[PDB]
């Protein structure tokens, strides 16, 4: 139904080793389409999805300049955050930015984003109203105030409401056959006895796009989520994804309950039951 | 399509 466009940024300071690293990666939903790593032999905005090469030489040229500048912008920011956070030069630090927007089935803007993180923890995020800022601490408030005076939030709102919506709509259209194609999971359950009085029922889901999937193990009744173990939704390496969910069933008259799987690529939520 | 960073910290 819904669609999202994201631009992930990472700036890692490596003193004692050399100049910092800047890697910017773009995604349309769960598919990568662009890449700019400043640590490449010849840094350039490179295609990553087949449905992006149709963009003219100007697209690549303008994005490369934006990224070659952003690299120097993030350099200054790594220096500024040493002063702000009362940090020394010797240390190795990390700045992360998440840009982009979520759009509904009607192609209209649902939520806008402009988040920042310093050393794993949050820094400065743009509020849903696309007018106000949320500072993680009093050092981030210095950026909040620098940005409020310079009317930064207005510039973001312009991109998130405009530019980002228009480009997401173009990307989905070029990658129609892939980005907007329903790919359901390949379901099956695996049984293994953890002991003699206990066993494991692992519910497998493989080859599915998009990433969003719900796997719930229910023992007759719904609420059995507090004792079920599930992994992170992992990528297969060919656009499609994987995920399992294992519950520790006893031994006897117990291997009789079911598992439920929800994916937008499914016409109905599937229900699995194991038997040898 | 990514735009330039609006302003530094």
């Amino acid at each position, epitope marked *: 139904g819904s669609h999202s466009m994201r631009y992930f940024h990472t700036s890692v300071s490596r003193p004692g080793r050399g100049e910092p690293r800047f890697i910017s990666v773009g995604y349309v939903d769960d598919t990568q389409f662009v890449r700019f790593d400043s640590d490449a032999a010849s840094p350039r905005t490179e295609p990553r999805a087949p449905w992006i090469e149709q963009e003219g030489p100007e697209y690549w040229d303008r994005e490369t300049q934006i990224s070659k500048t952003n690299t120097q912008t993030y350099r200054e920011d790594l220096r500024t955050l040493l002063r702000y956070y009362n940090q020394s030069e010797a240390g190795s630090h990390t700045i992360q930015r998440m840009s982009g927007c979520d759009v509904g089935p009607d192609g209209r803007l649902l939520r806008g984003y402009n988040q920042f993180a310093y050393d794993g923890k949050d820094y400065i995020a743009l509020n849903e109203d696309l007018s106000s800022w949320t500072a993680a601490d009093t050092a981030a408030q210095i950026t909040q105030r620098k940005w409020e005076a310079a009317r930064v939030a207005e510039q973001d709102r312009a*991109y998130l409401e405009g530019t980002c919506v228009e480009w997401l709509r173009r990307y989905l259209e070029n990658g129609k056959e892939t980005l907007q194609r329903a790919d359901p999971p390949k379901t099956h359950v695996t049984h293994h006895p953890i002991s003699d009085h206990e066993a494991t029922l692992r519910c497998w889901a493989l080859g599915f796009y998009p990433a969003e999937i719900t796997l719930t193990w229910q023992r007759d009744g719904e609420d059995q989520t507090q004792d079920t173990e599930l992994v992170e939704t992992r990528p297969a390496g060919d656009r499609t994804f994987q995920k399992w969910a294992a519950v520790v069933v006893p031994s006897g008259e117990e291997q009789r309950y079911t598992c439920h799987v929800q994916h937008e690529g499914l016409p109905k939520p599937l229900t699995l039951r194991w038997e040898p | 399509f990514e735009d330039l960073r609006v302003l530094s910290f």
Partner: T-cell receptor
Amino acid sequence: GITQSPKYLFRKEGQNVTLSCEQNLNHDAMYWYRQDPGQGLRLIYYSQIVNDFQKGDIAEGYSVSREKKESFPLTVTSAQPTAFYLCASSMSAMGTEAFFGQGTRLTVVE
Amino acid sequence: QPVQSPQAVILREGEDAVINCSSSKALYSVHWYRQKHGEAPVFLMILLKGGEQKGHEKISASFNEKKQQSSLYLTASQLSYSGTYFCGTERSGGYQKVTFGIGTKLQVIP
């Protein structure tokens, strides 16, 4: 504010001169212009951050460097005649207001 | 690139002058500067949106629907209003530069 140096400057034939522009407002963006009657204001070089500067549209004959946030000096080489050079500097550009320097009058004296 | 409609105008003291400017590419913001030939252009106002703002008499500006075309209004024109009015245009990714065209040479006659 912004200090553009010098106010008045002469140049000999085939000579190179470096015009100064310094700020303390901690502005990220810096701009160099050339004013000529009928042509108006024209962007030589510009810089939105340290180490990064971009050309267009008046060059060759001009060279710049952005070693610090404070300074953006324009070096006018052996190519170009006589003109009035102005210098701007904005906090985050696009968006914010650009503040100017006094200006530089450059005449080529043979 | 930024086109200014009057380009040069001569008017009586107190007479109401209207300077117009337009673009082809949608701009994020429009700056208005006034300059005294061999001096630094003095900042008038900036417009980010999207309608009329602000109606501050003597020197007030308008920015059309969406977008490109912005006009400057001068009501009770005084002798100090004389000079070259410049329109500063700024564009989104990655055309972030303050662009000026041939400014309008406004002459107030006593």
